[PDB]
Amino acid sequence: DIFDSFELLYDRPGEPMINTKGEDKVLFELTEQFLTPEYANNGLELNNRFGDEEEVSRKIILKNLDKIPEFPKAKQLPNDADFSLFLPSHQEMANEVIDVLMSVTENQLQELLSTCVYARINLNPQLFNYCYTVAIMHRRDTGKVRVQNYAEIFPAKFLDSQVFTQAREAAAVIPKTIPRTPIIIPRDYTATDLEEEHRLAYWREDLGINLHHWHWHLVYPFSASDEKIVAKDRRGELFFYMHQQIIARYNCERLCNSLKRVKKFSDWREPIPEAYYPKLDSLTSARGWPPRQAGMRWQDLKRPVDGLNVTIDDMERYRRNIEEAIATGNVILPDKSTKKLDIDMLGNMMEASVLSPNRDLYGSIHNNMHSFSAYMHDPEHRYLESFGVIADEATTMRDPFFYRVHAWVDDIFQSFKEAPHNVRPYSRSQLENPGVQVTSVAVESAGGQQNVLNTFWMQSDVNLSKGLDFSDRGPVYARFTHLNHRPFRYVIKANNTASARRTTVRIFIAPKTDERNLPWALSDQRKMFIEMDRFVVPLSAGENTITRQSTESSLTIPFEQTFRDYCGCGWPQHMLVPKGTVGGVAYQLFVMLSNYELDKIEQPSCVEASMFCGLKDKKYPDARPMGYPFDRPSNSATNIEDFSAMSNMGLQDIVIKLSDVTEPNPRNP
């Protein structure tokens, strides 16, 4: 039952530990060591009173702390402030608290729990939640603790602010023993289609996609005191690839909505046409996340409390330095010696991570792009305002401008991939798989046609009760509308004349035509190919039939893992397929059976979605460069049909069709 105690420390983040926690009314028995000035003279009496109440299920006795944890940096963040790692002072606070939690003796779980209880009581709730989660994920003794669903704990990061007065009313009016009716979240709450960018809202604001984004950055942080935490296998390359695929997916959606490929934000002194009014309010700070009006521009940041003292001139210098590294192929080290640039290193230089080879010279461009963009309303703290949604990993994907930032970062990576002195196009011997001939590729659907994927709209419930501070208990559901698809399978036929007895199946799709309704050049379409699955299969001699269910995708995690029915990392299964259109949009399905001898990685709970997430405590499980075979230009084909003629590759026209109907999730309570 100690693990239940750890899980409870997630509950109701804006409540003190004076009163009970959880659906089951569990009391933490406080002592003098666990008081705060706010409750210095009455705290224990109040805690006694709350635990003496009728419905209290049990009381947790805490082990005495022999030494009081010290938090000299982190104690400076007020409890009613908003927390972001893009602020240098907040990163330092996080490293301090993580270090404390990580330092507790292995297997001393009563000491650990008391240390975490102390941290929670004395620290900002967002900061505590982040640091506690990082510690739970990285310690060796906390394997059995479930990190509580982030949308249940901080639902304000995921909802429409207008849900909350209704939620408080429902919890107050209807007793906890009687079901409360779900509160329906409108499809159009941040805007209507009067705003063209609003057409993508269903995707940008998707809870599953924003949860994934949050969990990815949790698994792959750019900073820690322990380099071991940051230096997971090929994280720099994965930073590139994951975001490149996010941009590819968003671009697929844009073309399904009469919009163009997203425009990179590269001219950093120009005004920014995209507005965004996120409708989110912080329950921690009581503040609306400041919006962005059309036509704002970056301004030099002078926010010494945040640790932000950086100019546009600085950003332009850093970018010149990075562009020079790409142009020469060499990075300059602090001692003035050089080293050859590779994609992993460039990912770390760009982010930046603590693994950058020269942070003094190359700065931290991507992190500062977020900063600059989040503070255009208050760049020098004149207005006592905080950062916009673009500065929080759980909310950032909601903002259209996130994609302009990442289009530019991706363009930087592509300039490296497209430069022959940095990256060489694949040779025939790198692409081929001698003796393996793909003879057909199809998708099939139960109740569906051959080569048609069918999408529709679904309403699903999330419980916000755990995040609703000072409410009565019992579930309170918000019912939100999201994209989904009818289940399908791939059927791939191949004749194996030779000796291969295993292969990696790599599946990608891309729209058949561009914004002009014209066929693509492969040099452009390669960046539009979205990876759908990647998995090793045996091959027999002669005829093979490979069948793969859409539910088996190594990209995704199931609904029941994203939401309550590396656990949280993974693209949500309901967003695997682009929306398409009511009329149907032609897509191209590309399948490759690659040479396992060059794929293989030789190495010795929930679903692990390795494509974006890699594997806990292991090497990224594919030896190829991430995005293979489309990560770089072709030297012998200018279109996908010519590229696909190779024996081990297949290509098939498909149609994505939207059925514009809304159905309830069968998993709803």
Partner 1 sequence: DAKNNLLYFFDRPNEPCFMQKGEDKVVFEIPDHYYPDKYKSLSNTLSNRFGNEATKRIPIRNITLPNLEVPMQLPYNDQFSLFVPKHRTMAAKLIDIFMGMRDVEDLQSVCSYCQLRINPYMFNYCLSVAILHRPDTKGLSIPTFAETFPDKFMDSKVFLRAREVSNVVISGSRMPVNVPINYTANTTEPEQRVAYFREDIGINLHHWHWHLVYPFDSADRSIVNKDRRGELFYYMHQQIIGRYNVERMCNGLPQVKPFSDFSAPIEEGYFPKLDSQVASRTWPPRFAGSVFRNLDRTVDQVKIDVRKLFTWRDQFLEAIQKMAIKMPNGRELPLDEVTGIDMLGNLMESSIISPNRGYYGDLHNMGHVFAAYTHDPDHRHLEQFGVMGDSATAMRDPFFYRWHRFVDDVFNIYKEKLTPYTNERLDFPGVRVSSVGIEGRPNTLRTLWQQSTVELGRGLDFTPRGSVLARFTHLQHDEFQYVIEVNNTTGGNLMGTVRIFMAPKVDDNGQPMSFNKQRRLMIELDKFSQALRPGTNTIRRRSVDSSVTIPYERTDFCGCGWPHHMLIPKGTAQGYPVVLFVMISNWNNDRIEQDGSCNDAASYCGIRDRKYPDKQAMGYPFDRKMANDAATLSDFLRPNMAVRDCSIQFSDTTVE
Could you list the residues that contact partner 1 (CB under 8 A)? Answer: 14-16, 18-19, 42, 45-46, 49-50, 80, 161-166, 168-169, 171-175, 178, 181, 188-192, 194-195, 198, 275, 277, 279, 281, 285-288, 290-291, 293, 296, 377-378, 380-385, 469-471
Going by the DSSP 8-state scheme, the letter that residue 472 receives in this structure is: -
| Cβ–Cβ under 8 Å, residues 476 and 568 | no
Helix, strand, coil fractions of the chain, as percent rounded to 5: 35, 20, 45
| Cβ–Cβ under 8 Å, residues 566 and 616 | yes
Nearest residue (CB) to partner 1, 69 versus 182: 182
- Active-site pick, 96, 152, 197, 351: 351
Considering the complex, what minimum distance in angstroms separates the CB of residue 276 from partner 1?
8
Nearest residue (CB) to partner 1, 164 versus 566: 164
- Residue 298's SS3 state is coil
Torsion of CA 255, 256, 259, 265, to 10 degrees: -60
Q: Which helix (H) or strand (E) holds 120?
A: helix 109-122
Considering the complex, what minimum distance in angstroms separates the CB of residue 50 from partner 1?
8
Considering the complex, what minimum distance in angstroms separates the CB of residue 175 from partner 1?
7
Paired tokens of 374: 């989040």
Paired tokens of 375: 């503070």
Paired tokens of 340: 């050859």
Q: Is 370 annotated as a binding residue?
A: yes
Considering the complex, what minimum distance in angstroms separates the CB of residue 42 from partner 1?
5
Q: Is 243 annotated as a binding residue?
A: yes
Nearest residue (CB) to partner 1, 157 versus 657: 157
Helices marked H in 159-231: 163-173, 201-204, 207-219, 227-230
Nearest residue (CB) to partner 1, 282 versus 595: 282
Q: Is 217 annotated as a binding residue?
A: yes
Cα radius of gyration (the chain): 26
Q: Which helix (H) or strand (E) holds 449?
A: none
Considering the complex, what minimum distance in angstroms separates the CB of residue 91 from partner 1?
24
Considering the complex, what minimum distance in angstroms separates the CB of residue 12 from partner 1?
11
| Cβ–Cβ under 8 Å, residues 203 and 250 | yes
Cα dihedral sign for 575, 580, 582, 586?
negative
351 belongs to the catalytic site: yes
Residue 650's contacts (CB-CB under 8 Å, 6 or more residues apart) are 438, 439, 440, 441, 492, 590, 591, 592, 644
Nearest residue (CB) to partner 1, 224 versus 280: 280
Among residues 284, 288, 285, which one has the least CA distance to residue 162?
288
| Cβ–Cβ under 8 Å, residues 417 and 343 | yes
Nearest residue (CB) to partner 1, 378 versus 461: 378
DSSP characters over 77-106: S-TTS---TTSHHHHHHHHHHHHHHHHSPT
- Residue 151's SS3 state is helix
222: amino acid identity, one letter = F
SS (H, E, C) 342-357: CHHHHHHHHHCCCCCC
Residue with tokens 């993508």, as numbered in its chain: 200
Q: Is 213 annotated as a binding residue?
A: yes
Paired tokens of 64: 């005495």
Catalytic residue ranges: 351
